[PDB]
């Protein structure tokens, strides 16, 4: 998972 940090963005449409 090279973009795992993105899993922490809870403030998007998805």
């Amino acid at each position, epitope marked *: *998972n090279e*973009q*795992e*940090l*993105l*899993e*922490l*963005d*809870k*403030w*998007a*449409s*998805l």
Partner: antibody, heavy 130, light 108 residues
């Protein structure tokens, strides 16, 4: 003023279960990650894991996964850390800290924010002894 | 997980001295790095995030720099109240590991 108020220091025997809490005020508890950090006597900081109270999504360090559960009750602005069976090596100070997010990003896709622990509880001293 | 080292492990310097602590990561983490200060008897305090952004309430003499694998925390004019332990932390991917720490002592 954001404030994290942690539960009191405890002593518990080996094998016992324990749940400690951190009560939050001053911001929307459901809207930021919040986490737990261990500090063993005379040692450095160890990031244990975080939880997002909004949906209770959790991320653990693999060193702590399956050994502790982090949970949250957003109805009373409280985050918890639990053990099923304490070991003597669990003796430490446990801090609960808000893992705030920084930077600006689009609503229409996931953003790589800068996350940092900007407000910390006073710490809970946990002692495993008979 | 990502591994961080800090150098040195402890240092001493005089009041007014410029002092640098170095963090090094096992992979490039861009600017996704924080610095914290822990004074004895106290919870840690956030000093810097995004590698160089100073947090509100932190004195100007603290500065962070570096990008990718290597990072430095600089205290420009060491004051006695800076005697403490400093931790870097990567925020690139969970777990957000803390470095081992560097203790700063005042020489007087």
């Amino acid at each position: 003023q954001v404030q994290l108020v942690q539960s009191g220091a405890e002593v518990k025997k080996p094998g016992e279960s324990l749940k400690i809490s951190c009560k939050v005020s001053g911001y929307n508890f459901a809207s930021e990650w919040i986490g737990w950090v261990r500090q063993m006597p005379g040692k450095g900081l160890e990031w244990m894991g975080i939880i997002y109270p909004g949906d209770s999504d959790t991320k653990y360090s693999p060193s702590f996964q399956g050994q502790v559960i982090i949970s949250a009750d957003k109805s009373i602005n409280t985050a918890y850390l639990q053990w099923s069976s304490l070991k003597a090596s669990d003796t430490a100070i446990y801090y609960c800290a808000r893992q705030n997010h920084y930077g600006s990003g689009s609503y229409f896709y996931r953003t790589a924010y800068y996350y940092a622990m900007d407000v910390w509880g006073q710490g809970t001293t946990v002692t495993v002894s008979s | 997980d990502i591994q961080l080292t800090q150098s040195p492990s402890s240092l001493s310097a005089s009041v007014g001295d410029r002092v640098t602590i170095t963090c090094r990561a096992s992979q490039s983490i861009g600017s996704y790095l924080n610095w914290y200060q822990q004074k004895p008897g106290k919870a840690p305090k956030l000093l810097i995030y995004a590698a160089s952004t100073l947090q509100s309430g932190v004195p100007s003499r603290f500065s962070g720099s570096g990008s990718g694998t290597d990072f430095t925390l600089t205290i420009s004019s060491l004051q006695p109240e800076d005697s403490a332990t400093y931790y870097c932390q990567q925020s690139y991917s969970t777990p957000f590991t803390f470095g081992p720490g560097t203790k700063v002592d005042i020489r007087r």
